Scaffold this active site. Structure first.
Site, PDB file in Angstrom:
ATOM      1  N   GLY A   9      27.063  55.407  24.384  1.00  0.00           N
ATOM      2  CA  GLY A   9      28.350  55.918  24.873  1.00  0.00           C
ATOM      3  C   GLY A   9      29.384  55.913  23.769  1.00  0.00           C
ATOM      4  O   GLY A   9      29.035  55.672  22.611  1.00  0.00           O
ATOM      5  N   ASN A  10      30.645  56.160  24.111  1.00  0.00           N
ATOM      6  CA  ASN A  10      31.692  56.348  23.082  1.00  0.00           C
ATOM      7  C   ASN A  10      31.505  55.553  21.770  1.00  0.00           C
ATOM      8  O   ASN A  10      31.275  56.164  20.716  1.00  0.00           O
ATOM      9  CB  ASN A  10      33.096  56.087  23.639  1.00  0.00           C
ATOM     10  N   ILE A  13      26.138  51.229  21.670  1.00  0.00           N
ATOM     11  CA  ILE A  13      24.801  51.529  22.141  1.00  0.00           C
ATOM     12  C   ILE A  13      24.284  50.286  22.836  1.00  0.00           C
ATOM     13  O   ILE A  13      24.251  49.211  22.240  1.00  0.00           O
ATOM     14  CB  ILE A  13      23.875  51.874  20.995  1.00  0.00           C
ATOM     15  CG1 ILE A  13      24.340  53.205  20.367  1.00  0.00           C
ATOM     16  CG2 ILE A  13      22.461  52.001  21.481  1.00  0.00           C
ATOM     17  CD1 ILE A  13      23.485  53.700  19.225  1.00  0.00           C
ATOM     18  N   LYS A  14      23.910  50.442  24.097  1.00  0.00           N
ATOM     19  CA  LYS A  14      23.199  49.427  24.830  1.00  0.00           C
ATOM     20  C   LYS A  14      21.728  49.811  24.873  1.00  0.00           C
ATOM     21  O   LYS A  14      21.380  50.986  24.878  1.00  0.00           O
ATOM     22  CB  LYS A  14      23.749  49.316  26.255  1.00  0.00           C
ATOM     23  CG  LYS A  14      25.185  48.873  26.350  1.00  0.00           C
ATOM     24  CD  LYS A  14      25.535  48.590  27.812  1.00  0.00           C
ATOM     25  CE  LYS A  14      26.960  48.976  28.165  1.00  0.00           C
ATOM     26  NZ  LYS A  14      27.065  49.244  29.634  1.00  0.00           N
ATOM     27  N   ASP A 100      24.479  60.109  31.111  1.00  0.00           N
ATOM     28  CA  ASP A 100      24.760  58.761  31.519  1.00  0.00           C
ATOM     29  C   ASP A 100      24.984  58.658  33.023  1.00  0.00           C
ATOM     30  O   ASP A 100      24.433  57.755  33.677  1.00  0.00           O
ATOM     31  CB  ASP A 100      25.961  58.196  30.741  1.00  0.00           C
ATOM     32  CG  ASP A 100      27.226  59.060  30.814  1.00  0.00           C
ATOM     33  OD1 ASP A 100      27.255  60.272  31.105  1.00  0.00           O
ATOM     34  OD2 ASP A 100      28.299  58.456  30.456  1.00  0.00           O
ATOM     35  N   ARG A 101      25.711  59.611  33.571  1.00  0.00           N
ATOM     36  CA  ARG A 101      25.971  59.640  34.995  1.00  0.00           C
ATOM     37  C   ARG A 101      24.664  59.878  35.786  1.00  0.00           C
ATOM     38  O   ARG A 101      24.457  59.210  36.822  1.00  0.00           O
ATOM     39  CB  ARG A 101      26.994  60.712  35.363  1.00  0.00           C
ATOM     40  CG  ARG A 101      28.419  60.525  34.725  1.00  0.00           C
ATOM     41  CD  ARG A 101      29.261  59.350  35.300  1.00  0.00           C
ATOM     42  NE  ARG A 101      28.679  58.013  35.205  1.00  0.00           N
ATOM     43  CZ  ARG A 101      28.672  57.246  34.096  1.00  0.00           C
ATOM     44  NH1 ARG A 101      29.287  57.640  33.012  1.00  0.00           N
ATOM     45  NH2 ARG A 101      28.024  56.069  34.078  1.00  0.00           N
ATOM     46  N   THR A 124      36.999  55.236  29.580  1.00  0.00           N
ATOM     47  CA  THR A 124      38.243  55.914  29.216  1.00  0.00           C
ATOM     48  C   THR A 124      38.825  56.643  30.414  1.00  0.00           C
ATOM     49  O   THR A 124      40.013  56.581  30.692  1.00  0.00           O
ATOM     50  CB  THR A 124      37.995  56.909  28.064  1.00  0.00           C
ATOM     51  OG1 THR A 124      37.612  56.136  26.912  1.00  0.00           O
ATOM     52  CG2 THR A 124      39.252  57.660  27.746  1.00  0.00           C
TER      53      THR A 124
END
Ligand SMILES: [Cl-]
Lengths: 257, 244
Positions: A9-10, A13-14, A100-101, A124
């Protein structure tokens, strides 16, 4: 056996290494601009499944990390589609939904079987998604998050006093320390912070109540993404936190037939 | 008899000529530049009472217009203070409250005597003010307005019109632009409703939601709380100040 799962994501990283649809051997996280994960220790994965909403530089970085460890590893860049893993995509153009969603909807469907859900993700933006117990993703709402609202007011509105990004942090910490009551304020900076908190909590609470009335069955409010401690404390409606919906969804995709 | 009342805000300058209590002989408005009000026709006022939140160039324009018609007219620049016209200022530093907000609180107190109020103004920001039935202004909440929220997300007039036609209690959208528009609208309505319920709880009594000036049809329609519109709270407040 094992699948490497990357949720980019922004800034963050996971990642997880999963040997089933629901079980992680290990996991971690790192900032993509600076860090390298400790993957020298991991058992070699069969493949990688990647959700990346962080852009092309992050895509190149992920590939570099993968190939430095397991050259030419098979990988799948996850995207939203019409239907997958028990979820049906209600978007007019399914592929326009963020990856991601999509992964997160799939993870939620599995994590809370038999339940209607309202999934709130704090980033955000604050994103709300309605997911039926039968797996139909019926639609979304998006609003600015608390810090983004505070930037609008504290930095972009001439007629209001300046409240920097960092000063907003102070106000947010104070909201949490006060258990996020957000009373009507007696100074303008606090009026901004409390009004923005009230907007976030009011959004989530209104959407939940109306979804129960629309669907005529219980709805679980599921909290995902950032901690949003003040916002979580403010809520007067019941809620369940789940911190790994996206990675869970990726595991499911990876281990699907 | 008559008092000239000037409400200079960010967008333009509104004015009224008031004779007896809150009654206006006439009223109008003008842009900050180039427009001139048709004040040649007016009966000469005793004085002028000015709320100006628009800055020094606006202050100079106002003085120029006043002195061109009534040279050396007495005038008073209104500022928020600790207590005036039945209202008590609960701000920690009373003078930090905007003069427009102050005049508006005074106008509201007079318009709805004995009532607890939640006053909502829809501008670039959405401003909410709590006014207790005894006249205590007990505080405020501010959030971005709908357009500002939209801009922050990267985005609009068509979307806003489309929202008025739709069910605001079944708002989930099936494309991203509509999810943004609906999400921002739900935040506005949710804010107002939550704040209102909070005041009814705090005060253990009914609260009237007063809409100060206009609001998008979509926001007003989305509310489950009934409201009362009042478009001249500031000028009404200024009339009360002038006569006091
Ligand atoms: Cl790591």
């Amino acid at each position: 056996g094992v699948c490497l799962l990357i949720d980019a994501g922004n800034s963050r990283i996971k990642w997880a290494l999963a040997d089933t649809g629901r079980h992680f051997v290990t996991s971690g996280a790192f900032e993509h601009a600076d860090d390298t994960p400790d993957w020298s220790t991991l058992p070699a994965p069969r493949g990688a499944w990647i959700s990346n909403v962080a852009g092309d530089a992050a895509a190149a970085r992920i590939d570099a990390l993968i190939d430095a460890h397991w050259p030419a590893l098979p990988r799948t860049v996850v995207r939203a589609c019409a239907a997958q893993c028990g979820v049906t995509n209600g978007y007019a153009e399914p592929a326009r939904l963020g990856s991601d969603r999509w992964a997160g909807l799939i993870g939620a469907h599995a994590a809370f079987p038999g339940e209607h859900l309202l999934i709130a993700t704090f980033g955000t933006a604050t994103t709300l998604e309605a997911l039926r117990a039968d797996g139909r993703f019926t639609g979304g709402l998006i609003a600015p998050g608390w810090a983004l609202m505070m930037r609008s007011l504290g930095m972009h509105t001439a007629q209001l006093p300046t409240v920097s990004i960092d000063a907003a942090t102070s106000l947010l910490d104070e909201l949490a320390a006060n258990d996020a009551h957000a009373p009507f304020a007696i100074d303008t900076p606090h009026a901004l912070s409390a009004g923005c908190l009230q907007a976030q909590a009011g959004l989530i609470e209104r959407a939940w109540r109306d979804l129960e009335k629309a669907w005529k069955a219980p709805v679980r409010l599921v909290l995902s993404g950032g901690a949003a401690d003040a916002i979580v404390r403010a809520l007067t409606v019941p809620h369940t936190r789940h911190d790994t919906l996206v990675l869970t969804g990726l595991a499911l995709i990876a281990h699907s037939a």
